[PDB]
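Supplementary Note 2. Why include the ligand at all?

Several targets in our set were suspected to adopt different conformations when bound, so apo predictions alone were not considered sufficient. For every target with a known small-molecule partner we therefore ran a joint prediction. The input for sodium ion is given below.
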Amino acid sequence: DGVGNASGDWHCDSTWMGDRVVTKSTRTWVLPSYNNHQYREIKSGSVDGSNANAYFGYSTPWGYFDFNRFHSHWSPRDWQRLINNYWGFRPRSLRVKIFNIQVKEVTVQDSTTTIANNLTSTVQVFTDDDYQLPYVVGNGTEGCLPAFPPQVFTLPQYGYATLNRDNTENPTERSSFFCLEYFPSKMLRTGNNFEFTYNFEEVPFHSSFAPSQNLFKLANPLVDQYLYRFVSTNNTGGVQFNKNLAGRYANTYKNWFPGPMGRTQGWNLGSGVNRASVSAFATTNRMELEGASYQVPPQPNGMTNNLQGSNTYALENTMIFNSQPANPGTTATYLEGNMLITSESETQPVNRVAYNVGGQMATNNQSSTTAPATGTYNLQEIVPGSVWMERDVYLQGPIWAKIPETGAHFHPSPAMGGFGLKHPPPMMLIKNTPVPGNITSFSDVPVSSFITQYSTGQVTVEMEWELKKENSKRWNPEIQYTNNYNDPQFVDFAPDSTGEYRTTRPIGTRYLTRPL
Amino acid sequence: DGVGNASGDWHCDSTWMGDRVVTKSTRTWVLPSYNNHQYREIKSGSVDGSNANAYFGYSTPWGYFDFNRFHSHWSPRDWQRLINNYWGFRPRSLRVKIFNIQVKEVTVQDSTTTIANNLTSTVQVFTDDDYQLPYVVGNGTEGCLPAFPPQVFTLPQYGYATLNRDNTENPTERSSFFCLEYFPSKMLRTGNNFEFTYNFEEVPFHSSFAPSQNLFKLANPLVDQYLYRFVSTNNTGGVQFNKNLAGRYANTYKNWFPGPMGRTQGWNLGSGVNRASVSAFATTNRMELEGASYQVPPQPNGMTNNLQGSNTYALENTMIFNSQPANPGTTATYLEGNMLITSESETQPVNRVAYNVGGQMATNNQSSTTAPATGTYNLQEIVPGSVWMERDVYLQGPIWAKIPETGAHFHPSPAMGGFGLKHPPPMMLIKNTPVPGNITSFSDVPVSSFITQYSTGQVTVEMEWELKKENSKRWNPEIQYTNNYNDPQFVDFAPDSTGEYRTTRPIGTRYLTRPL
Amino acid sequence: DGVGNASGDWHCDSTWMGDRVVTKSTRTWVLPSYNNHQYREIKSGSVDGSNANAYFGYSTPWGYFDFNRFHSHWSPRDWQRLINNYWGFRPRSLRVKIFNIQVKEVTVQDSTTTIANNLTSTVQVFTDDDYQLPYVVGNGTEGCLPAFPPQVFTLPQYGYATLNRDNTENPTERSSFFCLEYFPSKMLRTGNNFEFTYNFEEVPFHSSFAPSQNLFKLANPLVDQYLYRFVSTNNTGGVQFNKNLAGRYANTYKNWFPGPMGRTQGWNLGSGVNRASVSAFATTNRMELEGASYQVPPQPNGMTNNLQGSNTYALENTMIFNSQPANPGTTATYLEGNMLITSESETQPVNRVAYNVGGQMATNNQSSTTAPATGTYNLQEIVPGSVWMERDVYLQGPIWAKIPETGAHFHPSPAMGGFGLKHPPPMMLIKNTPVPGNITSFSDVPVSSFITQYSTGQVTVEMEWELKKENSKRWNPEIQYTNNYNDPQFVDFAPDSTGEYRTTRPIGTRYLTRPL
Ligand code: NA
Ligand code: NA
Ligand code: NA
Ligand code: NA
Ligand code: NA
Ligand code: NA
Ligand code: NA
Ligand code: NA
Ligand code: NA
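The joint prediction is reproduced in token form.
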């Protein structure tokens, strides 16, 4: 309504009400006027010897709002609270509000560089509710709301990648260009604000519990089966079998089978033992798409890295986050120390080991002359009677991802973990309306010189989650996430002398135990 | 109400009413007071050279009611009746009742060992309706209701297996212990009884019919296709094709594809021909889970063993039951004779042969210098346009199995055949309340000496099944299960001189024929 | 109603409903017919060189029901659940039921010793609702309901201690004798049962949280005080002062003062360092009552043992429980290992160190000739502006205790921790009605020979607790009780191979953090 009046109050809070909890988090932000208010055609030929890095696309002046990161909404304890006493959760509804828009104009004379605000200028927000733009938000890229309410953050620029021709930079006749100014968008001078309201589609509860039974040894030990297994051949080519018995769990008919597997090699950590001076890329797991070899991280789930105990990890199949945020374009080498590496060990009983072969099966036809032989297999895909656990979500991990448009998706859980959404939280685009510099002469060609200015405002995301009440009959105490350190010299998830937020370790959600 | 009065009448019966039939079967049972009313920690290190047999779990004083075995509810003829004129069936509802509880106390002096009944003592029944305990019943273990109403049977002890550490006996911090006395349970002295009422979740009709068409040669022979296939290359590297024609069924575009396959080797039976003195285990098919190789029986369905005709069987992929019940802990070798072995030949046209390679595909890129080459594959998993038949259920086979708790199950049919249930018939636990011996001095430590006593009562299971009315236009008579023997010297499915129930052969359900 | 019918169903369960949770636990029990149905005058002269052990009292045939022990109602996890996410709790209501009474009669011929049940005999239960009997239950004695539902336990005999004359065994004219048969009590043959209903008086929530601020350094560091302190004297006897400043927390006016203290000496544990071959008794803390020195355990709270970190413990001031139950009358020496020792370190910031002096104050009057002097004090009692935390309750610790009858109690929290109740859960007395042997001749003297018989039945205690919802604004994750072990070789709070319940460690309730 007026320049003087606050566009909105500041809400940050967690409200636990029965079976559902709602998280409101508000933060402050800056929007540079990227690209000086013009689109740039952007492309890249193969780099580091890989045509897989070749792409053709565009860069826009628009910045976008990303909150698809659990820790944007959850405080550490709140996370803890959720992960220690709940069997699952899914996000039901979401509402966003952008306010307190303040736009500033900077002018530099002889390197003076002063910042003063014009009140006249506007900002533009619109939400792509019909998913007509490329959806960038699903793919684990920087720029989400901080995990720490205080810290101010700068909005990521919006750019998308269309299809390359022939793993060269060049475009193809099918490649398309999207203009963001084609959608109608609200324009906000300082008095005004934006409110976004949303309702999540129905998705299965993320299963935040670990199996207390091993899949194969489901059957009670006490009683033998009524089925028998082939065991040997008498001296004449005659078949003989024995009863499956009691405890033995190797030779017992099974009803259900582990998850889809594809070996990705295991590397030791800590004490370790790894091969020396090794170039990782040649031996990484990959999928060939459009005649180029692409690395696939988080090899599609149905597998596990680490067994608890031993340090070996399926690095190809694993989620790794920096301890602290770092910078754009960094090429610096990182040792194990800095990294927050994650173990899928909790999901190990249901899931298969990623650095072991998946099993073996007979490779020959037996005969009088010739004995039976078997062959191990490094990759078993999906089968009926399958059963597995999808990868755990982390306080630091992403929340959801958009399902690609195609005729079919096999049942889909983002390989990076989270909620597979057909219709996910809409792209939220915002840009600073351009203000022309001093233009004194008319031309047909478009204006090229602009006043340089950026915007800053606050934004609040309010989310509603539904919970699966914990209900177990387990007698003894379950393991839970404890803030347990010995001889600490600083708090975890807390500012330091310098003032920066410190996060020591990643946090899964699997602590509670459910028998199969 | 009173010691003298019967807690319940005896119901055994089959009622066929239109499209649905209800089976009531009642039997008699004994419940030993296992473990002298205490839990035992039970574990096993690797045996027979396999860490797969390593497990950590517990044994309870509770016995359980298992009826998950088709022949508990169906008399032979009734089975027959169902299998010869129906295209499918699923269980809609179930109701159970336990009554006529009689508890007896045995005392032995100088080896006298007398049995007299105390009327004062109780028994405990409760049903785990919320699936909070490990579900043992799904996994084809002994102790179900007899197939023969007269025979008295002893209730299986309840024990479950939690997760092992490192394929050693030892437990893990995630391993959980369940106390059965934590659930509230009805206590029954002799006058009282138990009634259980249940409603099955909706499941697809088990398809009890065999295809009368071969999958690939679906198209009518009379007419050629309007598509053509590449056939050869002219002397210059030039492509040439011919019309697909008429009857030929090898080279004709196909819309649908066979089921998932994984070779498990074939062994001859009867006349046979098998390799001599062979140790089966090295060459068995297996899956690696938690860093141990486990054998998987009934290799997940989508495959067949036997083609009719020839005796070769996919033993790894097959269902084998003893002819007669046998004993706990038996290690005796069994020849073919005793076994009731099953052929999935009826499902052969839709399904793939288990001891053959699944097919072949090109393994090289053709060039002027270099000719095209192909490679057979021993394991093909799931694909779009797939189609297969799940394994047939047997009078002797199990009915249902519980789906494991995880984020996803690919469409699941118990590998052992039956109905995949998310929420299956609840574990039914019963135990004898302990009666202290003579205790004359107080101690803080728990009482250790008990009166020795066991319980016996009857129980009835009443089930309602829905049927898919047979409706075919097949002119000529279909094959049906006939009780056909030549020169019989005893009846089948009938007592003998000794008094024991004799079952000669297994009985599938596929007899009726449905064109695709 | 009838011998045959169950007097009551078995309820064991924990129901969490919003702000209040209700715990139902049911167990089995035995009641020996103590004393052959007669009272015994019992007394003791000084033993182990202490007249403090001298007492005069009586022993009854009655056994009593004790559940005043947290772990009787809480399963491990349930405890956990409560202690990790709640700021407090108090018991609002309680209801008890005794049923399934079974009375047995034992006869021995030539050492045969058979147990058969007579159905005719009765049992007697009554509750002393008017607190007219000596209340024994408050004082941490054996015989409470087991922590493990399965285990059967024997009811403690009821005996009370009246006043001794002169620290000799002999009675005094003021000493009184209570006859339990004077109260009217329900008599129960096997068909019948007992129901007890109760409502707790209003008591402050047990504060289950640890202070995140140190009492003395409450004031913010950033700002100095506006008060100044005397610091020195100029060379002439002149007073000079400095401003209290900033961070310094030693010399800053304080509003609130630590808790009441009385030094009890500190002993090292683990690595330790303690004096060798030491007789503990001479140097133990004590209070003189009726001209005898009595040891006081749990020296009245307002103090702490242990500071976290260092192993030294105020053993006199500490709660120690055996790892496993042990036996009546044991004199066996116990090393540290067996013991579950407790640290009040969480309450350390508010509370005072027990093995340090409490402080110091000036002991002289300063003059020109003579400098000021100070003296440490080993015991400071209560003062206005006091503030402290009462000792934490343990899964293994007792729940409540009865306040003694006198004109005044200073604000009272059982020194053993728990709820100080003016009117606590009534003594629940039960005894087996005596059955005369064969008496063939009349006498005036009371019958002396009885049939020997004992009773066994189940009992259920149902409690309702109110909770203080956790509500904190602490950003970083709080510490919580985790079931965290490394290289476990058995589960904790779970049966072992032998069948006995294993409890490794004690569990406080202070995990959550509240700033002052
Ligand atoms: Na730029
Ligand atoms: Na929607
Ligand atoms: Na670095
Ligand atoms: Na046994
Ligand atoms: Na149901
Ligand atoms: Na044999
Ligand atoms: Na006695
Ligand atoms: Na009262
Ligand atoms: Na000892």
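Chain A touches chain C through 25 residues (CB under 8 Å). The longest helix of chain A spans residues 76-85. Comparable summaries for the other entries are listed in the accompanying table.
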